[model samples]
Target: QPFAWQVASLADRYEESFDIGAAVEPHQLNGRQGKVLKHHYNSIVAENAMKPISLQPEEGVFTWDGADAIVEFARKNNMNLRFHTLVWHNQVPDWFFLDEEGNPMVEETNEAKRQANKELLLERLETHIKTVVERYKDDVTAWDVVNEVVDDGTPNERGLRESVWYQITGDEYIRVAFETARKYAGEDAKLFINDYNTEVTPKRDHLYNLVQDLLADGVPIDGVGHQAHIQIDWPTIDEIRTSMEMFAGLGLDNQVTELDVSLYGWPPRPAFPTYDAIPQERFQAQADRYNQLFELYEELDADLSSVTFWGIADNHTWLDDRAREYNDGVGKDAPFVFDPNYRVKPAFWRIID
Candidate 1:
């Protein structure tokens, strides 16, 4: 039913030129979005949520129910698939480290669970990288071998501060992940360190400096995936431009892997959207801000390979539940260019045109 509807739209939108496609679940992309990706974007990102794990007791289970479908769909269409991630702290199953009681062992002292965690982490990571990368070595352009290590500038915590990986493996996990990907991935496939918050803030700068050193020390890094999720008025264009330049100076292939813009205000509650009710005057300002950011991407054209929007529309956004009631619930952050009806908005034209 929806397949026919999606196919019609796909023929309409992607029949002409390639555009940026989103990272969606494989099965979700079936009818319309699937066709659109086949015709439109030169590349597609596949979300690895619910993907397999190398960590036991879940280890050795090739559960690709989500990712396999997407990968196959991409392969059939001859579209390049960029694996969203190989290592992330979220979307991970608790069973990865839980005992039979389903309890995760935690100890304040770093030494307590350090050795055990390190062994488990290495085994899980090594198995995952080797399996996943080798399976798709022929088609993948790059892999987000490591993701989101620097949590918005905080390091006193764990895993970047004290997570199992950081607590036991230290920062070596970053290096290990990249090298592992290299060993498993095709020689031509690029290995990237994907992260948000690379703007010119102290938190981001500290991370950038660390990466710079890692590269200088020959850590086998190939690229930087800058998640360009900017605010209505956060980092200025100059800051973004500077950051891109800095990354380029490191001889890294820079990708605008995840691009989405949000207003500090978007909705009236955590789960509802209030944008359609906003006056045209307010919407125009919002549209213009998006235009300015797109202009920055255009200016940075040569250094950039692709720019991917995080989601396709405002209605199905994940932030609704996460930050919905933050600002008196009038929060209507119109992040993407599609309306709830899937019609293209002014922001989309600003980027594509």
Candidate 2:
């Protein structure tokens, strides 16, 4: 395979035990199931396992308890590890933006926070990154450094509809995160800015412009993470190829960071409270979508560095009924290569085919 990676998103758990053991133990499936998963990916990354709490430990104090465990596991397995991120507005520690006693200071306002918060952020980020990077110096291959900086392309819904990054860090946070990662990632490790939605839409074009300017300004950006969280048939093959061509022209490596095709009802559907009924058409459609998307990916596989599914099985996805699509009550349309039962679906065969 020409691709530099094929990564699996894993929490700190192992579901099955083989003579060789399993990389992740958090999954509930066990017995014969664990052996099956071990064959899925050549690399594994701890999901939300390297956050500031795990990396920074406590307010400004650098800690490696969480990150170290994951790193050691990767080392033992001879699998490459990629640190998900260092600066992101979501899933971040509350104290990251606070001044005293967990208070959001007036200086904490969008404009003023930079003057005060910038130092704090940089200090915390530096301590965390330098420590984490130095500890796993030879093991870490890449870092997501910056994730989801662009608008989600649909609207401001809940926390993401209008992200706090725009308010707190201004437009410059994107540059700062990547530049900082480059400074510490050594000369060879790739630094990527990962986000969703980019196939034949103005939303991605705008992001493209932002990245182009950043690259021109010597931002030290080396890669673009096109996380294809998408509807099966929306973008079409031609559209995806066009986007790939456009991104490749940017003189940066391209990686499909979190690639998965889901039921079209995700962003706008109501949750199907329970699995009283199975969405047969929805499941089949997801498989069809995967086949189409992979056909395109294989065509462009020569330039691609990696492709990481958002998660393994649909039932295990974090977006189940809580995040955005709980209103219609249709529940999450299963979009993984395996069902909740961990049985491989048609999509898995399509991927290998």
Candidate 3:
């Protein structure tokens, strides 16, 4: 049982519930990292390569080298895909929000100017989605049409994140994104609205309510992507279960997108600045959380369709430099299922169980 993680693939183990996957950068797709993905994961998402900015950094200029590599890798290995984000507040060039005169527009002061910006933004959105979606629509299994459009998982009036996309276009950006993606993403596309901290009730309610509005208007949204970027010590399994079951009632699919159990506490622990400093008990606890969550996913398999780890291994993660936000730069995180050496950890064995 201890060596079970080395014995079988996670994608095979979860075959009945849904496909299992990992998010990866292009550079990581080499040697054993490549072998790890080919063996265990059945689906892969672009860690950053396929995003709006990465694909098109300058206006009317497109870069396909990085994304093409990942797409090629998935194709060669017969793995499925979830194209991370056609639209988002971050990473996008400022030109999307610029006014006719090339000045950044005001938030709410001028209605006439805002309307002009809105028209320009929507048209650009339509073209952008058409170009990117059309290019690989045939290969993709799903699309994160819009990502992190909700505010902090706290109580609020609109419950929407007020990015430039919102300030100028209001909620129109979301509607157009899904609409445009559907228009070009072919007949078999699955569209998802993705966000983080979906386990919190306030944010959950906001996203749930937004999805309802979209459905009533006849929008073709197909599912919700829960960016389950969870921590080991918070948001218990029941909390996650409640959110998934709530979305299940919405009659849309659920996916655990960008999932990883960070060893850092919500505020991050002051100790364990280095990987060697982390204790064995800490790793075991992380293993338990992974095991528990998958158990819940299995029980709710009908509604929960996929579980994607945030990274291939613990060596490189979004939380490495990020863990310092909680402490005063005294901690690095080791949350993923593998160590720096590529050996599977207790969490891997636990999930493989």
Candidate 4:
């Protein structure tokens, strides 16, 4: 039998403090995965359901069935919901850029044409944001107003990624998105700019400056999401704390969104970690890392709003098969608090205790 203490739910334990949440796919919520999610997390983020691709699969036709299911599920369970991504550079359809003749723009053409394209893009963006934000205004506690606008490891003009959105509308796209999100979602709505790898200096500095500029311009952004998708020994606790302090210096709440630590070795290659074969040392190390981070989070309780793990269990992690192809077919990495069998590990106990 499982240990008696293993029955404790993380959501129940952390409810008074901050939301303990996980990113979830709808199918995972039907079986034990569902049970574990409901038991442990008080908040849920649709892994892909709310994205533009899923929400608006075709032009002028908005599909709410998929996203609606998730909203209903969260409501049924009384879990706080975070609608991921009102604006993203990816996950949009080709129809977004098509013309009155339903043909894609072949080229930039001329300055006049480019300016027209920018206006068309903004109109599309505003419509999508208004539609999605208005649909779940009451249900969703927060929204990722814009995601991953900062790209790392290179020199960028004013730290903004040269994304299709930026290319078309310039920095004004971000300002418009946040403003539109605020207008539809209301003043009380929690809107966040979420991105990955803020631990890296170049990206972090760019994001810091970018948000500062946005705030100076009176954007309706309320928070920043640091997607702690890291590996062991990198982005020491100190580095994370410094970043959090910088964000808090702007009087914005910081959230640990998409937190997961990959256990893959450098020069990654194809390899699956078997439970029985995993080194106890690695397990202990991960547990220690989690404990330290939790302690840091608790210490900065006021500055943080929530800490959301990317997945419920190692087997369910996106890093499993999806990241494999890019990492030389490396099968999977243990990046969550639970094992494949839905049992808590040392990391879980460390966090709870």
The TM-score leader among the candidates is 3
By lDDT rank, best first, the candidates go 3, 4, 1, 2
TM-score per candidate: 0.82, 0.79, 0.95, 0.94
lDDT of each: 0.65, 0.61, 0.86, 0.82
Which residue segments of model 3 deviate by more than 4 Å? 1-5, 107-109, 153-156, 325-330
**Candidate 2 lDDT (Cα, 0 to 1):** 0.61
Worst 10 residues of 2 by lDDT: 11-20
Expressed as tens digits, the lDDT of each residue in 1-353 for candidate 2 is: 11111323221111121011122333422444434445555455556667555566466576565666667766765666666767666777667666654665324555655577666655555666666666665887767877777775645322132445555545566666766666776778788877777775666676687778788888877777777767677777787788777878887777676665666544535545444355666667777777787666667765566666666555566556442445544455565776666666666556555
Off by over 4 Å in 2: 1-34, 100-116, 153-168, 268-276, 322-332
For residues 1-353, write the lDDT of model 4, one tens digit per residue: 25323578887777666899899887787688888887788999988888887888786799888788889889999998988878787887878776556655435767888788878878888998898887899999988989998877554678788777777777887998999999988899999999998877889999999999889989888999988987777789998999999999999999888999777644335445445657778778888988898888888888988989988887778776655765565566788888878777788888888
TM-score for candidate 3:
0.95
Candidate 3, run of 10 with poorest lDDT: 1-10
| Tens-place lDDT digits, model 3, residues 1-353 | 22223657888888988999899999988787898888889999999999898988877999999898999999999999999889999888777777768788655367776788788889998988998987898779989999999988443476998878877887899999999998898656999999998988688889999999989998889899988989886788998999998889989899999998888766665747788889999999999988898889999999988888889877878887677666687667887778877787888888878
- Output the lDDT of residue 147, model 3: 97
Q: How displaced is residue 230 in candidate 3, in Å?
A: 0.7
Q: Which candidate is the best by lDDT?
A: 3
Candidate 1 per-residue lDDT over residues 1-353, each given as its tens digit: 12222323322343233235566665657555554455446567765442334222265666665676767777777666778788776665555554334555344245645566656667667877787777778867778888777656555533153455564577777878887888777567788888887885665676677678788777788878888777666678888888888878878777777777665543323423466654555455657877897677666766666666666556556555445566555455667766655556666565545
| Position 289, candidate 2: lDDT | 79
In order of TM-score, best first, we have 3, 4, 1, 2
